[PDB]
């Protein structure tokens, strides 16, 4: 803010963010990216953390190969996690009847909750890899885009405590609402 010309001044106005988010009648799912790698998505009560690397922790032979949201009930004991996972996959674009399925764990297994999707840019699943890349770009402002075109690349989502330093941005929330169709926000 300084004098420009002879009687005119140049000054700026910045809009608050915490008030708008805490003031909405419903609860909004918010996306965040901390440091330069750690992606985060917080729904109602699911504070999911997303990372990318070429580590295969799940295998098709011994797992649950989720193809439909009905089978998702066999993974977690809490409905909020199921809602968050299903709607995130719907928002990125995963129409469940024409696409490869994705792998999760049986709930009775004593190894927590986790879901992972392979998006390696190889011959097979190349189209799925590009579609997921576009979805990630649209759903995250400055996408780091790890696991460049090479041997392997698998994304993993796990439940962690929500960190109290994420910049509560709202562009990503708007894109999540726009891409996600028929998303029902509670409260």
């Amino acid at each position, epitope marked *: 803010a300084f004098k420009i010309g002879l009687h005119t001044e140049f000054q700026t106005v910045s809009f608050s963010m915490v008030g708008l988010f805490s003031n909405n009648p419903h609860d909004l799912p918010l996306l965040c990216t901390l440091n330069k790698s750690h992606l985060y998505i917080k729904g109602g009560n699911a504070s999911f953390k997303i*990372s990318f690397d070429d*580590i295969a*922790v799940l*295998l098709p*032979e*011994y797992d649950v190969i989720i193809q439909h949201p009905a089978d998702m009930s066999w993974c977690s004991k809490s409905d909020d996690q199921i809602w968050l996972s299903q709607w995130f996959m719907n928002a990125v674009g995963h129409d469940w009847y024409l696409d490869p399925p994705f792998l999760c764990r049986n709930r009775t*297994k*004593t190894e*927590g909750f986790i879901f992972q999707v392979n998006t390696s840019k190889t011959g097979i699943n190349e189209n799925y890899a590009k579609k997921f890349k576009t979805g990630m770009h649209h759903l995250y402002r400055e996408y780091p885009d790890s696991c460049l075109d090479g041997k392997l690349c698998l994304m993993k989502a*796990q439940p962690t405590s929500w960190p109290l330093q994420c910049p509560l941005d709202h562009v990503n929330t708007l894109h999540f609402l726009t891409r996600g169709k028929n998303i029902q926000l509670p409260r």
Partner: antibody
Amino acid sequence: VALVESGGGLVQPGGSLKLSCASGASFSNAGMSWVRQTPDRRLELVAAINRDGDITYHPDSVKGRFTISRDNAKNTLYLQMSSLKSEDTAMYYCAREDYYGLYFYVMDYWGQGTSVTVA
Amino acid sequence: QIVLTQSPAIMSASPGEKVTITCSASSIVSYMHWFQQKPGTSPKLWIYGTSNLASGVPARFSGSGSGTSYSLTISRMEAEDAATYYCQQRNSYPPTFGGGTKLEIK
């Protein structure tokens, strides 16, 4: 972190046992397990208890005879197992279990263990 | 029901050498862990993730794997390296261990 065990010894082939196993770590944020080592050096997992005692698992070789329950207030574990058999004479270890690596859930701090004998 | 076969059962190396331990599976396994044990004691975790060293292992131990076959490697071993090693996989319940390998120093 330290772990102690008690309740082992010699028992007739057909009795029932209650083995007791923690200190140092709050242990309310860890999932634990019990494993067997036969007189020949061979290992096998027999009990696995989730951080919350809501989920508890045992394999076929102990299904219907081995149960494990943790007293969080005392930071202890009681494993009750009936129908003693000769093949179930071995060393028993109670071991912690935590995440080492963003996705790896592996056993930690295997205890001293106690001897169970059938004769 | 994944089974694990270790090779070889008995080792007798030289006071400072490079040794390898082979661990094959019945079916494909993604990740594998290695545990170490001394006589008259309890096993201690040594390698996790087939590539991650344990908290307090000298920088001469390493691991690798592919599909069904995994390997453990010691570059320059000393007398302290004489003990028993166990494979472990936790992909399909029940989690299964190896048959155990004993390594001794000549």
